Amino acid sequence: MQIFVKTLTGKTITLEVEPSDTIENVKAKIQDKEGIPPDQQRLIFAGKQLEDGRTLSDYNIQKESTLHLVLRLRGG
């Protein structure tokens, strides 16, 4: 399924994911496409910070949803 990741630069990127994927795996996909190290990535959905060990499904993230990406420490 496709999801959107809205960054703070005004760029939105698209990802192909499964609801069984971990949040950790999603951050790896973002590093693959944009080059951002996972430990700099804070992902937010429905007002919740997403935990690396949980899955998209745990958060009820459905197709065509948008996550918000905020960068910490170095990227923020």
CATH number at residue 52: 3.10.20.90
Please, which experimental method was used?
Answer: X-ray
Task: Starting at the earlier edge strand, list the strands of the sheet with 41-45.
Answer: 12-16, 2-6, 66-71, 41-45, 48-49
The resolution of the experimental structure, rounded to one decimal in Å, is: 1.3
Task: Report residue 22: phi and psi, to 5°.
Answer: -75, 155
Question: 10: which residues sit within 8 A by CB, 6+ positions away?
Answer: none
Task: Report residue 60: phi and psi, to 5°.
Answer: 60, 40
Hey, what are 2's tokens?
Answer: 């496709």
Q: How many domains does the chain have?
A: 1
Domain residue limits at 4: 1-76
Q: For residues 29 and 21, what is the distance between their CA atoms, to the nearest angstrom? A: 11
